[PDB]
Amino acid sequence: TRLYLKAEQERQHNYLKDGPYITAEEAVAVYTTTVHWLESRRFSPIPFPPLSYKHDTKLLILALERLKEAYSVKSRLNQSQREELGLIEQAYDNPHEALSRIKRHLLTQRAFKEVGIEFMDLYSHLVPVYDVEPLEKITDAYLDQYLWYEADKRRLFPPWIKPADTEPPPLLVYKWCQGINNLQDVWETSEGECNVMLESRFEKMYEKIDLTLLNRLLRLIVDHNIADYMTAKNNVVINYKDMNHTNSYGIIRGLQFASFIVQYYGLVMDLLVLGLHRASEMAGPPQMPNDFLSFQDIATEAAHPIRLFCRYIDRIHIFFRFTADEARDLIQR
């Protein structure tokens, strides 16, 4: 672990030396592509949580239920372990003060406390575990529940983005296989047409997310103040035992709302991979959107090599079908 955070401190150092590894015109290109996609989807930017929001109480109860899930019934309860539980049950006691506190943290708080990190000893690879201050834990948990509810309401996330709440991953596999097998004459190789099935990792998605660009992209789909919070939230010092660094490039990836950031940046990269045309054809018109793997009409389906697309949290699985001519053009290029 000590070696790893030394390496991460050094990596932050090369970032703050070299500045943004992404070039300015790359930034304006991705910003243009995303704003074009969102206006095509007509999307309505997320407003700041209203004081008298109809579901607000329900969202805090769900957030504190999720927090309590972490604390199993046990006697291993230290000062912080009991402080978090006590504050959770306190917010349970008075939800309105919790709403007010989370809101005031939203519109003002920008500088936060250090986050401790410990690692899981999966014998193949090491994954960090971030420990966030309980007040910030409650704030981010509520903001997570709110943003996920609102994005699900407005359908920010097109159907290809996984995992969804409609099907467990073992059903994702089955739907993907069936969707492959139900394409138009997908298994015919008389003329010589070839199906290509790619899968990848989006290497170093979490680390190589430039937080300034993350601010610029995410300022549109939500209120700019919420953006300022969550973007300030990943500009936070990391500590373990004694040696502590501030992180600026990588998303903390342990925040309660890191899920939303990852799944939105994934959609932006998704626009990059698919192109607005094919992405729109997969998603369908905003009035009548499609399901996981289907198009309005088969002509829309057979208009491009990319028939099927599915992005997991950071993985991509793409299924092309080529004519012989298309294959040869790509091979020669």
Binding site: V127, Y130, A151, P163, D165, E167, Q256
Partner: protein, 104 residues
């Protein structure tokens, strides 16, 4: 082994001995994913039918209804009888959150 299936019980009449084979495997008591998925589709079409006809009946679906479809449907039919269920319909994006719980 058959030797460990012998047991003895003593009463006033005396000592009486009795016997009773393979242990059951975990893979035989869990429905395969394929059958689960087809049953889910069937059961939820059936529930669509029953819910529309009960809305015509203007009543709520009961326990005696759907009782042949109790432990079926990938979103389990039992989940329409939970108490919090109305609040659960406000928990969005729970699966991503669960896949990010290992991270905290």
């Amino acid at each position: 082994p058959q030797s460990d299936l012998r047991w003895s019980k003593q009463t006033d009449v005396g000592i009486t001995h009795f016997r009773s084979q393979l242990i059951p495997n975990l893979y035989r008591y869990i429905q395969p994913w394929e059958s689960e998925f087809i049953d889910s589709q069937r059961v939820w079409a059936e529930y669509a039918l029953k819910r529309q006809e009960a809305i015509a009946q203007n009543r709520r679906l009961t326990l005696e209804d759907l009782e042949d479809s109790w432990d079926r449907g990938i979103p389990r039919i039992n989940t329409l009888f939970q108490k919090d269920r109305h609040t659960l319909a406000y928990d969005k994006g729970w699966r991503v959150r669960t896949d990010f719980k290992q991270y905290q």
